[PDB]
Homo-oligomer: A and B are copies of this chain.
Amino acid sequence: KQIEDKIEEILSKIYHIENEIARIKKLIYSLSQSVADRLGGGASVNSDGTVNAPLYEVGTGIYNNVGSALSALNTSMKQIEDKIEEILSKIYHIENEIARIKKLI
């Protein structure tokens, strides 16, 4: 009689815990999908809740993670900065040659 009230409580709890477990699994997968969405690049969700590879294009390179794409951008930017540095130096020299010519003619 009274022991039975306890058994029914326990079974009720187990039922609700099983619901909580199913809800937690759904939450995890929803989090996974949100991560795939904010990574972009075609990243998607596997059945094990992991996020599979995006395809990020930088120049003629393809990359499966943000760091490698950022690094490819960074390298290209540095090459451009170097070239800009060279151009600016060349233009300085050209200005000097013109100033010299203008003086002498």
Contacts and interface: CB of A to CB of B under 8 A. Distances in A.
Interface of A: 3-4, 6-7, 9-11, 13-14, 17-18, 20-21, 24-25, 27-28, 30-35, 37-43, 46, 48-54, 56-59, 64-71, 73-74, 76-78, 80-81, 83-84, 86-88, 90-91, 94-95, 97-98, 101-102, 104-105
Contact of A24 (B28, B46, B52, B104): B28
B102 A105 contact: no
A54 to B, nearest CB: 6
A72 to B, nearest CB: 9
A29 to B, nearest CB: 9
Given A27-B49, A35-B51, A57-B71, 13 more contacts: A3-B3, A21-B21, A28-B28, A31-B49, A38-B39, A57-B70, A59-B78, A73-B77, A83-B88, A87-B88, A91-B91, A98-B101, A101-B101
